[PDB]
Structure 1
Amino acid sequence: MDIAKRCESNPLLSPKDLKAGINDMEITCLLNPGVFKFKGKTWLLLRVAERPVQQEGIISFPIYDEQGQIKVMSFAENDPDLDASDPRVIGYKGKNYLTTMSYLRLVSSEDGIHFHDEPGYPPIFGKGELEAFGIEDCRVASTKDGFYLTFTEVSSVAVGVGMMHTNDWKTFEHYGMILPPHNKDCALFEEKINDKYYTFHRPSSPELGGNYIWLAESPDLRHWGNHKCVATTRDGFWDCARVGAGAAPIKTEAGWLEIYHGADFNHRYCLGALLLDLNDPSKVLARSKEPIMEPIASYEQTGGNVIFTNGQLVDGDTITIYYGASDEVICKAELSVKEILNILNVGIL
């Protein structure tokens, strides 16, 4: 099944490798990095999750107050108004809170393996009401007009999608919430088709639907419409519970090649391939029957049974994905375009 060539140095980055970005917090997780080239280097835009030192019998976590300043909230673990069954999202008196706060952090490399913070390139932290609980899982589209970031915006009122733009990775323009709750896994295409922009996204339905891959179009990147359902989950398959796009699709001669993630009802996450028509990206030409990558390395099963990619580089036939493993550490692997197309029974020349 698995056709990924893992980097021998995996994991490349773990929580212990970096100093905490938020005063008095500690890094619990590094994951789901955006990937791009800039100034001769390979860059990761890390999702970094932080929280305070946990005292016994007490769950403690950061929030931004109304003034955009960091504070700490805490609950007794045995509080009868607390549901802490999920370790990511807790409930207290009918309201939801995250156990950590995520922000986006830049690291660079000259070899694609050893990464470090770069002086003059500080992190991107959540701003405003709709990002009070943090920002997550940022895709980076490298385009002729610069870099477009599409990420989860989290608050007490929404899990939604934001977009920002940069040329220099120091100043940013923010386009607001482009897609309302409940939505994430937003993969902007790096070029126009038929004079429009396109993105994959992933709305969640409480009923009459599920967690499927969708398409939307835009004339301007700020405003989105003409929504289309591209690919659902598949009953009795590895991807029966939820699907979502990763990074931007790769332009091949046979179509748009999309490395998506799918999960089963055991919360095991694997990677598959979708091939969409060049001119009509809502049209599926091919889909992996089995995964092309599964969480089978030791570091892909800790703490659990998760690989997740939302960033890659492509050089000829070689795709270099960067990925989160166990929602905790950062890893690299290579895949072959032609091998994927061959396995998919797609003709190539």
Structure 2
Amino acid sequence: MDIAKRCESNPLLSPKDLKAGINDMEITCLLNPGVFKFKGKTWLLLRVAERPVQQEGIISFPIYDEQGQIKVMSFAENDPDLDASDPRVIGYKGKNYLTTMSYLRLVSSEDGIHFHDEPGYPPIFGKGELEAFGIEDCRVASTKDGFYLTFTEVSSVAVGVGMMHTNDWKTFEHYGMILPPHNKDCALFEEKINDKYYTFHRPSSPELGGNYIWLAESPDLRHWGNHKCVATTRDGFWDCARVGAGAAPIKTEAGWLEIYHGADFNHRYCLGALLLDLNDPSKVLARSKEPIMEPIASYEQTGFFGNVIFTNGQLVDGDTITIYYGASDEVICKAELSVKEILNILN
């Protein structure tokens, strides 16, 4: 029931298309880019995942140590104290680790299809205790007061949400961890409502709850409260295991239109649509029963972690939504959707 016009050039960016940004590492994954416009170009703020060349029978990966220095961790695949069933997150002696380190990297484009690094625009790397395992999946809020980045901060003590601000994409201010663990999928709204700031977010409950889309509000972007549960998973549907907002919602006359991701217990991620009241964004007006984009293309089906569509950045020009997205947690893609057709599906 897929209604997305894929870019014929997909994929736009694969790991081999770029030079590694961490010393002695290679690029495993390009995914989940933020999206904005600046100095006449379309930009992606890529999630770039890197690790050492893998040796037979050894999982090895970078973290930052206490002095901020890359350090390589190694575990034997047959070590009985190792749980490596999932390629993204492992356990060893009761503690969790990632198989890669991620950072944020700017690429630019004149055509919105061929992308390249930009001299003077170096990448954004984890800093501090709370970003020791990297930063990920950055949403970019294009606003009157500039650009606001909301991304996953990962470390041995938390998956949480950080926020940064920039005017020129060279200088940044860090607002710290705005949402504690375990939380991600933080889609900041690009405008105020009732002179208040709003964001979607996505706390995960070990028990007594799940992985649902929530709402919070803020006077100042640094401090958040009045949390509300917007939309849960749906038992026995494609979005039965988790849901999360992608990019900021689009202002329409029907309401706030959010292209959200959902996944089942096999970790197959699809896109869906959510519509929310203009003045109370916690009120669900409508929700696509079926996905509006499933992982159908071949580059969407096999990779580092397969059967995954994921967008946390987009552009809107009239009726035409241009989403950029990660495919199989490996490569960058572009596709187009129609507001009118989405709203039509919701009635």
Which category describes the TM-score, using the shorter chain as reference length? Answer: over 0.9
Provide the secondary structure at the position in 1 that maps to 2:185: coil
Q: Which moved more, 1:226-235 or 1:263-272?
A: 263-272
| Cα distance, 1:170 vs structure 2 | 0.3
**Secondary structure in structure 2 of the residue aligned to 1:340:** helix
CA distance in 2, matches of 1:77, 1:344: 47
Secondary structure in structure 2 of the residue aligned to 1:247: coil
- Alpha-carbon displacement from aligned partner over 1:235-283 (angstroms, at most 9, x marks no partner): 1111111100000000001100000000011211110000000000000
Aligned partner of residue 203 in structure 2, secondary structure: coil
Corresponding residue for residue 306 of structure 1: 308
CA distance in 2, matches of 1:73, 1:248: 36
The alignment partner of 1:186 has SS state of: strand
The 3-state SS of whatever aligns with 2:335 is strand
How far apart are 1:126 and its partner, in Å? Answer: 0.2
Report SS of the residue matched to 2:291: coil
Q: Secondary structure at the match of 1:311?
A: strand
Cα displacement string for residues 265-319 of structure 1 (whole angstroms, at most 9, x for unaligned residues): 1211110000000000000001001111111111110131110000000001100
Take 1:286 and 1:91, find their aligned partners in 2: how far apart are those partners? 39
**Matching residue of 1:97:** 97
How far is the alpha carbon of 1:84 from its aligned partner?
1.3
Equivalent residue of 2:140, what SS?
A: strand
Give me the TM-score of the superposition, normalised by structure 2: 0.99
- Secondary structure, counterpart of 1:339 in structure 2: helix
SS of 1:12's equivalent in the other structure is coil
Between the aligned residues of both structures, percent identity stands at: 100
Partners of 1:267 and 1:45 lie apart in 2 by 24
Distance in 2 between residues matched to 1:124 and 1:245, nearest whole Å = 23
Deviations 1:217-245 (A, max 9, x none): 00000000000000000111111111000
Per-residue CA shift, 1:195-216, capped at 9, x if unaligned? 1000000000000000000000
In the alignment, the residues of structure 2 paired with residue 44 and residue 207 of structure 1 have an alpha-carbon distance, to the nearest angstrom, of 36
Q: Which whole-Å CA distance do the structure 1 matches of 2:296 and 2:109 have between them?
A: 26
190-199 vs 55-64, which moves further: 55-64
Q: CA deviation at 1:62?
A: 0.4
CA distance in 1: counterparts of 2:39 and 2:211, whole angstroms: 38
* Deviation (angstroms), 1:95: 1.0
Check if 1:4 corresponds to 2:9.
no
Whole-angstrom CA distance in 2 between matches of 1:288 and 1:118: 39
- By how many angstroms is 1:4 displaced? 0.3
> C-alpha distance in 2, partners of 1:289/1:174?
38
CA–CA separation in structure 1 for the residues paired with 2:70 and 2:111:
36
Question: Relative to structure 2, which stretch is displaced further, 108-117 or 259-268?
Answer: 259-268
Matched residue pairs, number?
A: 345
- Distance in 1 of aligned mates of 2:160 and 2:324: 24
Instruction: Report SS of the residue matched to 1:310.
Output: strand
Q: 2:183 aligns to what SS in structure 1?
A: coil
Post-superposition Cα deviations, 1:107-138, rounded to whole Å, max 9, x if no partner, equal 00000000000000000000000000000000
* TM-aligned CA deviation for residue 78 of structure 1: 1.5
For the residues of structure 2 that align with 1:174 and 1:43, how far apart are their CA atoms? 21
Return structure 1 stretches of 4+ with deviation > 4 angstroms.
none
Q: Deviations over 1:49-77 (max 9, x none)?
A: 00001111111110111110111111222
Corresponding residue number in structure 2 for 1:131: 131
Q: What is the correspondence of 1:1-349 to structure 2 with a 5 Å cutoff?
A: 1-303=1-303, 304-345=306-347
SS in 1 for 2:16: helix
Residue 47 of structure 1 deviates from its aligned partner by: 0.2
Partner secondary structure for residue 322 of structure 1: strand
Shift of 1:43: 0.1
Which range moved further: 59-68 or 69-78? 69-78
- 1:87 Cα deviation after fit: 1.1
- Offset of 1:79 from its aligned partner? 1.5
What does the per-residue CA deviation read over 1:323-343, in whole Å, with 9 as the maximum and x for residues that have no partner? 000010000001011111011
Whole-Å Cα distance in 2 between the matches of residues 62 and 338 of structure 1? 45
Whole-angstrom distance in 2 between the partners of 1:298 and 1:78: 32
Quote the Cα distance in structure 1 between the aligned partners of 2:28 and 2:213. Answer: 29
The whole-number CA distance in structure 2 between the counterparts of 1:263 and 1:82 is 26
1:343 & 1:78 partners in 2: Cα distance? Answer: 50
Quote how far apart the aligned CAs of 1:11 are.
Answer: 0.3
Structure 2 residues without counterparts, runs of 5 or longer: none
Distance 1:259 1:84 in 2: 32
CA distance in 1, matches of 2:79, 2:264: 32
* Offset at residue 82 of structure 1 (A): 1.4
Supply the distance in 2 between the matched residues of 1:92 and 1:255 (Cα, whole angstroms).
46
